[PDB]
């Protein structure tokens, strides 16, 4: 669920 900043 945690968005990948890249």
């Amino acid at each position: 669920d945690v968005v990948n900043q890249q």
Partner: antibody
Amino acid sequence: QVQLVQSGSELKKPGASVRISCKASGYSFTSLSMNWVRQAPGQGLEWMGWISTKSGDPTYAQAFTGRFVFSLDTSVNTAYLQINSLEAGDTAVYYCARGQPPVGWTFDYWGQGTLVTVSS
Amino acid sequence: ALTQPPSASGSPGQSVTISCTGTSSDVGGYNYVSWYQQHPGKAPKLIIYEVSKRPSGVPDRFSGSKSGNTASLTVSGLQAEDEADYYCSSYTSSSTLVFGGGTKLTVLG
């Protein structure tokens, strides 16, 4: 080693613009995101947002939209923070901070910080 | 947005524990809580990530945990160099990062 080197301190007048550079060495620049963090004198850290070095897309924290631009020059492995329409309350040390893999919400390496002083 | 007590203190060799209270939408929702140590006029340094993990070079004297909506950093075996400001941070369900206000740790005696 992984290193983030920022440009020198600057004085700017109200309403002017300033651009701070954060030059990355020691790793593949386009492989990891870059975050920006502000610290007003005597105050705490504030997250400003992040930029993807793969797409170039910036994402700004709610308090830092409108006047703040994250940008990149990949050919010189450099991330840039531009502040426009400078205000007295913009006086702060600004840090670039690398996003540790796999998602970038941990800051493993930090630039040494740049003091921007806004004053007439 | 994250709540830390303003200060902390301990004697050389003893332990200090610093709290960092968020919400179910950050500290209580995810495992991306970080702790940074900052000496005056220096860049912050990562000492704990993902609630309990340590980056290269940080001794196990430093430990992190969380329960419910509050994360906690424990510095055991306090030394003079530990005197510094400590900041927690966490990911949010809004896909942002929030910091705590910081805790100034002083070594007494």
